[PDB]
Write a protein that binds this ligand. Structure first.
Ligand SMILES: C[C@](O)(CS(=O)(=O)c1ccc(F)cc1)C(=O)Nc1ccc(C#N)c(C(F)(F)F)c1
Lengths: 11, 248
């Protein structure tokens, strides 16, 4: 889901 | 020119602190809330570490994300056993500088069995005389040691990557001047690697159970770790995603 994706896409 | 190894040393995360209040008397809720938060902080460092590893962009982006989530626990454990070995000679668990567990804390955490096992492990770094460079390569290989039974989105590329990390560990092995001494060393290291996985398994099972009942025990999970536990972790516990064991 989106919380880890978002971390991964960001720093 | 040890190019692979220079990189591992170059990209190795520095020290990460939990933010635990050591002046308060130990409770289970506070110890685990501090471990959960430490987990997230260490996760951020593992993502930045992983993305800068050799070949890692070979991977499909979804596989890139998946293996980080699957291997996370095993990596944390491995690095922690090394930190505990180097800093305090396995007399305590060096989770972080501001979160070191003595046996009282191991018991108060309610993961004593796992804690004592991670203490076995820490002591093996000494007993096997693991070199810093053996640790680094071993820790890298660990990121590529947990795969889904239904396959990755591009399994060929992962398989190429794992083969080559094993190559690098072979080269690291090779004092050299004896194939038999190289094998004996290979046997020992792969056995050390395999023993990380049941620990991570016990740890996964425990955190799973802890999330499910967290409201009952006033243990706070960061958003992100709750998603990973609830979304990726059960794939490991359900047997959909499996460690690659060297031995049997
Ligand atoms: C209980 C827990 O907080 C769960 S968690 O950190 O949220 C977590 C959630 C999902 C995972 F795949 C791995 C860890 C945990 O295992 N924390 C934790 C934090 C730091 C370190 C270190 N170093 C470790 C251990 F692996 F060493 F045990 C464990």
């Amino acid at each position: 889901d989106s919380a880890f994706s978002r971390l991964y896409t960001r720093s | 020119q040890p190019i692979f190894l220079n990189v591992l040393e170059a990209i190795e995360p520095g020290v990460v602190c939990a933010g635990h209040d050591n002046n308060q008397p130990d409770s289970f809720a506070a110890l685990l809330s501090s471990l959960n938060e430490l987990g997230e902080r260490q996760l951020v460092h593992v993502v930045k570490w992983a993305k800068a590893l050799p070949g890692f962009r070979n991977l499909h982006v979804d596989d890139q994300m998946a293996v980080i989530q699957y291997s996370l626990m095993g990596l944390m454990v491995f690095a922690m056993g090394w930190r505990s070995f180097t800093n305090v000679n396995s007399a305590m668990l060096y989770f972080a500088p501001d979160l070191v567990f003595n046996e009282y804390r191991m018991h108060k955490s309610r993961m004593y069995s796992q804690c004592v096992r991670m203490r076995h492990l820490s002591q093996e770094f000494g007993w096997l005389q693991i070199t810093p460079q053996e640790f680094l390569c071993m820790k890298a290989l660990l990121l590529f040691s947990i795969i889904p039974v239904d396959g990755l989105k591009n399994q060929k590329f992962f398989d190429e990557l794992r083969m080559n990390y094993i190559k690098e560990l072979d080269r690291i092995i090779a004092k050299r001047k004896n194939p038999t001494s190289c094998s004996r060393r290979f046997y020992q290291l792969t056995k050390l690697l395999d023993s990380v996985q049941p620990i991570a398994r016990e740890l996964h099972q425990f955190t799973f159970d802890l999330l499910i009942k967290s409201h009952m025990v006033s243990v706070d999970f960061p958003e992100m770790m709750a998603e990973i536990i609830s979304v990726q972790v059960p794939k490991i516990l359900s047997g959909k995603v499996k460690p690659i064991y060297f031995h049997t």
